[PDB]
């Protein structure tokens, strides 16, 4: 997976290499601080000299200011590659998510989409850089310390080379056994954890049936099991490191025994042995991290693989041919066979529904099925499987999706509002073309200045981020204002307000009449007024046309005509 | 953090003190493993040849065995206190959670409650213990190291004890600047984070207007502002440790310059200076983790304040005094007024309603305004604001709440079955009273035994999560079985299910007719069959009884009676 991530990080190598050289110097400023111990004792408290000891406090600041300056440079210029290999791939994920079919947001992935761009994005540069802060730094501390051992005491360095790899495999095997036991139990605590959710959801039945005592008893039992596995998990966790320390001490003791087993040893000065022993203690942490540097790296790269799954999914079907400036004619349906993806029940049978030019087709307000779904096919939110839809007396498959949707203009109370200025919001992707000269008149005839004027900055104000939070009816009104860039052939109004707010419902009715003077329409009709104002109501229910005819026919065949 | 939580720890202190003595010994096995340097460098490689050095390996395993065993005992017997102050906390929370009214479950908490029962109670004894390991182990390592310095070098130990408070306050102020800078802009990170979320949620209206290009353009700059603030976060985070190391090196250099003078020279051997240099390095970690004690112990108990608020909330109004054995008498609603909690709109104004003895009253959900709310007052899910419900000629406020819920028995499609045996499930809190002789016969004439026989074990099988997974109608039939054994003198049914499943509707209707044989049964009638079989219909919407009389009077005043 790192193979595929490499092109994404490749142009941002300049920060990486500076991180890969400012960390080696961070490994050669911890193995060179220790070397000064040999001058400090052999030449400072052995051969008694002040000249050899007065520059020591100087060089134990220069090395440490180097440690600080290289640590900052590493943590920054590796944060810079962890700011241009997480930001660029965030931008790629967002640019691909916007194009992906809306069916994906229909419970293929519904709430994790933030975590799939924020946290799961961060764990490709907060725990893959942690495998290049450690492979280089702690993997160079080992090399530096071994170079020190060779330069000072080959006699004990050979012994370390014999032993330390054995300590490493010991560390790995005990860590692996602990990890197996830990992740074996993780499913167990998850299973006993969801049990409490199962009780908490049914607070209702728990209250109604005779008592909670039988429920409290079971909760007590599962809590006791929770604890008696949690303590076992901790015992497995906190015993791994003591055994590691003990086996590492076996090396520290075997070297000390080998420091006197022959007469060849014990000829080493105090400085050399103090340096050697200090180095052995400073070899523990890098050995432990170099073995652990396959956990972090593979965690990060598996999370990146899952991000790649999100990124690699099929784009929206972009095979349309004809660019429509205006579908001057009318929309027609023809034998459309559509099913909700992920389901088996067909959503719509063969439909041949005629919507005429310059008029409106209403729909049965409460069909119970296939009411809002039929509005989907004009906007190609979910593409049709078989059967065609005739834009302007021309098939929809022939039309580019952007071109298709430029024509359509949806309105509903559930309309999600953009968050830039009102001037941009009304003319989103059209601000340079449709200037405020149009937007002033649009807000005039929108009947929405009761909140745009009252906002006191309505001509230019941020409309989202919950900045103003116009109510849902006002969202419908400003949706009409959005459509008041006009020339939109199809006008889908969900009309699901169910609330005749004072003059606002009459306002949207008047604006609908204005948008019906020149443009077509296709409305879901719950309100009786629109049903009367409808021109040809092709009522459809249960995936099949049940009745066709204008208001007089619907009065003749009431069906569900009420109130 | 003011005189808090102690009695939940107090009986479980015998495991605590073993953690407070197995950690001091863990402080006295890191400050005593270092002291052995002086024998090694004076009596070992220094003056004396051998025969004392040969003991040093044997005591760098014994001290290390004591290090490992102490660590294991501390990490186990401190988790045992984290397994009798977590388990006790969870049990206290849960036991105070189902007696604590349903009104809390009306989205005062949606799904954070699992946080407050699992994670927010793990993080009381996972970061108060984590701030008691450090304030004892690394609060005794300082004492051990200072004892070592005093015993081995009186001269420069005074210098160190002068600098240490200076290093400590330096650490405190740099950490405070880091805290104030990092957490100042974390809310800015939240702001830029939600900016992607809002525009992702509205996948619609980004694609209908062809605003994908402007969308990516407006996302790119917020991603850039994400990166350019994350860089400042990580630079402020990783600049603290270098400055800390540099100021601590200022100490390591000042002491070394002090070591140069003749006054302290020739009183410190090679071993003495090495041990007081190794100890100086081993004081860095304890000193810098001790100042973070209040950065965990108040990152901790502050979180426990949420649990204490949950546990301090008001209990359910169990002020009833009259215990009811059988409630065969009819029920009265007497000028009852009620509001759904947190809402100014009256959910139910004055109502005077009759539930006759051995008879049924049906409700039709036309407006969907209080159809289900009126059911709740019968079980007193939400208490009555004013007015009375004379149940069997006596008010609910007199009736003890447990008995009150015993008399009633809700049965709706939204019945949350609970994981248990099917027999115990059928006799929830009554498995001792109702034996299998009752269960099998009730299930037989509950018309559910076909489903019980369909899965594996039947009369003793499990009804657990993701197990048998009875359908909606099936679990409704389980609920009628429950009421059948309990013989609930009051019965409530919602019938929110719309589709009448084969081999279920006739069984449901026969069971219902059994349930009005000698029992009162209020019903919410969505089925026309139940409407026609209803005995005394009173139709209630908009908080008051809008229509009266049986289906003949409902034919006189049709409304939606035709449908
Ligand atoms: C006045 C005020 C002050 C006065 C003066 C101040 C002085 C300051 C000046 C310098 C300032 C900074 C410079 C510096 O400090 O140089 C550090 C680098 C070292 C270069 C030296 C630079 C100065 C040299 C001076 C030159 C002088 C001219 C940088 C640093 O600071 O790095 C720090 C780093 N320490 C070191 O590198 C050098 C450590 C060890 C290295 C020693 C260096 C040698 C110095 C020589 C003496 C000098 C004079 C003589 O030196 C120690 O500190 C303690 C030991 C020193 C005592 C002497 C020992 C030898 C004696 C001499 C023998 C001859 C430390 O890791 C080691 C710790 O780990 C184990 O602990 P635990 O196992 O869990 O208990 C050890 N276990 C041990 O068993 C050690 C055992 O004994 C030995 C057992 C094994 C035996 C043999 C080993 C193998 C042998 C051969 C192998 C085959 C502990 O040993 C202890 O304490 C116990 C202590 O050893 C007891 C003493 C034992 C005596 C030894 C022998 C005695 C005599 C021999 C017989 C006679 C030890 O403490 O982590 C810190 C925290 O940072 C964190 C964070 O908080 O997040 C922590 C981590 O994260 C955590 C988390 O918190 O979540 C926490 C962890 O617990 C862990 O769980 C981790 C996991 O990874 C998660 O999976 O997760 C991690 O992440 C980290 C980041 O990744 C990278 O660091 O970040 C880092 O600090 P930070 O990064 O800066 O924030």
């Amino acid at each position: 997976t790192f193979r595929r991530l490499w092109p994404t990080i490749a142009p941002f190598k300049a920060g990486l290499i500076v991180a890969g050289v400012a960390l080696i110097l961070n490994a050669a400023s911890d193995t060179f601080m220790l070397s000064l111990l040999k001058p400090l004792l052999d030449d400072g408290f052995g051969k008694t000299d002040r000249s050899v000891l007065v520059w020591m406090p100087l060089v134990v600041i220069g090395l440490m200011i180097l440690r600080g300056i290289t640590s900052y440079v590493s943590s920054y210029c590796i944060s810079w590659v962890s700011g241009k290999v997480v930001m660029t791939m965030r931008r790629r994920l967002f640019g691909h998510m916007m194009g992906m079919p809306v069916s994906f947001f229909d419970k293929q992935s519904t709430g994790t989409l933030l975590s799939r761009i924020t946290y799961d994005s961060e764990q490709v540069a907060s725990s893959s850089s942690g495998a290049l802060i450690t492979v280089v730094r702690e993997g160079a501390s080992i090399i530096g310390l071994f170079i020190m051992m060779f330069y000072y005491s080959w006699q004990l360095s050979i012994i370390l080379i014999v032993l330390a790899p054995i300590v490493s495999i010991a560390i790995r095997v005990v860590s692996k056994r602990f990890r197996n036991i830990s992740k074996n139990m993780q499913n167990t605590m998850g299973q006993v954890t969801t049990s409490a959710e199962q009780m908490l959801k049914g607070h209702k039945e728990v209250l109604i049936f005779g008592g909670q005592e039988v429920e409290t008893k079971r909760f007590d039992k599962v809590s006791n099991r929770m604890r008696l596995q949690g303590m076992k998990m901790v015992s497995a966790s906190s015993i791994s490191d003591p055994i590691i320390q003990l086996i590492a001490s076996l090396a520290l003791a075997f070297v000390l025994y080998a420091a006197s087993f022959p007469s060849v040893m014990d000829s080493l000065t105090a400085g050399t042995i103090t340096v050697v022993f200090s180095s052995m203690i400073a070899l523990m942490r890098p050995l432990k991290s170099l073995t652990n540097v396959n956990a972090q790296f593979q965690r990060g790269m598996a999370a990146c693989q899952t991000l790649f799954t999100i990124l690699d999914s099929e784009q929206e079907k972009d095979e349309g041919k004809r660019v429509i400036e205006r579908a001057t004619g009318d929309v027609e349906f023809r034998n459309v066979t559509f099913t909700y993806p992920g389901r088996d029940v067909p959503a719509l049978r063969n439909i041949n529904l005629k919507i005429p030019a310059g008029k409106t087709v209403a729909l049965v307000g409460r069909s119970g099925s296939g009411k809002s779904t039929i509005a989907s096919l004009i906007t190609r939110f979910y593409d049709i499987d078989e059967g065609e839809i005739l834009m302007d007396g021309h098939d929809l498959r022939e039309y580019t999706l952007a071109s298709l949707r430029n024509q359509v203009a949806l309105v509903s109370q559930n309309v999600h509002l953009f968050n830039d200025t009102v001037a941009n919001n009304i003319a989103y992707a059209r601000t340079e073309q449709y200037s405020r000269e149009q937007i002033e008149e649009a807000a005039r005839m929108a009947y929405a200045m009761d909140f745009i004027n009252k906002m006191d900055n309505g001509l230019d104000t941020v409309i989202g981020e919950n900045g103003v939070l116009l109510s849902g009816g006002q969202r419908q009104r400003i949706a009409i204002a959005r459509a008041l860039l006009r020339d939109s052939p199809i006008l889908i109004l969900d009309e699901a307000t169910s609330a005749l707010d004072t003059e606002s419902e009459r306002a949207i009715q008047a604006a609908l009449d204005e948008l019906q003077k020149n443009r077509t329409s296709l409305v879901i009709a719950h309100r009786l007024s629109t049903i009367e104002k409808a021109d040809e109501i092709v009522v459809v229910e249960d995936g099949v046309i049940v009745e066709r005819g204008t208001h007089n026919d619907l009065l003749e065949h009431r069906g569900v005509y009420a109130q």
Side-chain angles (χ1 to χ4, degrees), chain A residues 366-377:
Chain A
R366 319 298 310 180
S367 149
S369 86
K371 30 186 174 185
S372 313
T373 308
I374 206 178
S376 197
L377 299 312

Side-chain angles (χ1 to χ4, degrees), chain A residues 6 12 14 37 79 106 182 241 270 277-278 318 415 467 469 474 485 520:
Chain A
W6 186 250
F12 310 102
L37 286 172
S79 274
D106 315 351
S182 83
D241 302 9
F277 264 52
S278 64
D318 300 338
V415 60
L469 205 55
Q474 275 80 61
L485 302 180
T520 299

Side-chain angles (χ1 to χ4, degrees), chain A residues 33-34 37 137 245 248 274 277-278 280-281 283-285:
Chain A
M33 271 275 288
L34 281 188
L37 286 172
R137 206 282 300 288
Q245 279 156 70
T274 299
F277 264 52
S278 64
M280 297 296 180
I281 315 295
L283 188 147
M284 188 217 6
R285 193 211 40 193

Side-chain angles (χ1 to χ4, degrees), chain A residues 30 33-34 36-37 40 60 64 67 137-138 160 164 167 241 245 248-249 251-252 256 273-274 277-278 280-285 287-289 292:
Chain A
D30 60 43
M33 271 275 288
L34 281 188
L36 302 172
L37 286 172
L40 167 38
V60 77
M64 286 275 112
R67 148 149 296 245
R137 206 282 300 288
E138 306 257 17
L160 177 63
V167 190
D241 302 9
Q245 279 156 70
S249 309
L252 194 73
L256 193 44
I273 201 70
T274 299
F277 264 52
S278 64
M280 297 296 180
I281 315 295
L283 188 147
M284 188 217 6
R285 193 211 40 193
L287 216 37
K288 280 164 4 190
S289 291
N292 279 27

Side-chain angles (χ1 to χ4, degrees), chain A residues 36 50-63:
Chain A
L36 302 172
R50 262 63 154 178
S51 85
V52 165
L53 199 134
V54 290
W55 72 298
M56 223 48 31
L58 195 289
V59 77
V60 77
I61 294 298
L63 283 199

Side-chain angles (χ1 to χ4, degrees), chain A residues 46-215:
Chain A
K47 319 164 196 63
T48 319
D49 193 357
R50 262 63 154 178
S51 85
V52 165
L53 199 134
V54 290
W55 72 298
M56 223 48 31
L58 195 289
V59 77
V60 77
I61 294 298
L63 283 199
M64 286 275 112
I65 218 166
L66 199 66
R67 148 149 296 245
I69 280 294
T70 59
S71 194
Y72 168 108
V73 163
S74 79
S75 87
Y76 179 85
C77 277
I78 210 80
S79 274
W80 191 88
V81 172
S82 162
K84 283 294 186 38
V85 85
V86 74
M87 211 275 278
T88 283
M89 172 222 60
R90 272 163 137 161
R91 166 178 304 153
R92 287 182 60 167
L93 268 176
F94 184 82
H96 193 286
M97 258 206 187
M98 213 53 43
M100 212 175 148
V102 53
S103 60
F104 167 60
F105 286 18
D106 315 351
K107 297 174 190 178
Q108 224 86 18
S109 298
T110 185
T112 88
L113 301 153
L114 214 30
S115 274
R116 285 322 301 210
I117 216 167
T118 317
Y119 147 77
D120 209 311
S121 192
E122 213 71 85
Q123 301 300 290
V124 185
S126 162
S127 280
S128 174
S129 88
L132 260 166
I133 274 158
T134 296
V135 165
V136 173
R137 206 282 300 288
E138 306 257 17
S141 173
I142 289 296
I143 298 301
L145 292 167
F146 278 23
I147 287 298
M148 182 147 87
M149 301 335 307
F150 266 35
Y151 172 54
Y152 274 180
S153 181
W154 158 81
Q155 312 98 326
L156 317 169
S157 193
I158 182 58
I159 278 154
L160 177 63
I161 288 175
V162 168
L163 298 159
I166 312 305
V167 190
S168 88
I169 40 184
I171 287 152
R172 180 134 50 177
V173 296
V174 314
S175 296
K176 251 174 185 171
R177 203 155 182 261
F178 140 79
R179 272 170 296 191
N180 300 334
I181 299 303
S182 83
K183 208 175 179 183
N184 176 18
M185 225 86 48
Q186 174 258 353
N187 199 243
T188 314
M189 51 214 88
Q191 161 282 338
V192 279
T193 293
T194 201
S195 156
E197 183 178 2
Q198 164 255 318
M199 327 299 182
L200 285 173
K201 287 175 58 55
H203 191 329
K204 309 178 72 177
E205 181 50 291
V206 158
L207 262 173
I208 317 146
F209 92 79
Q212 321 91 347
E213 317 305 304
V214 171
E215 182 52 68

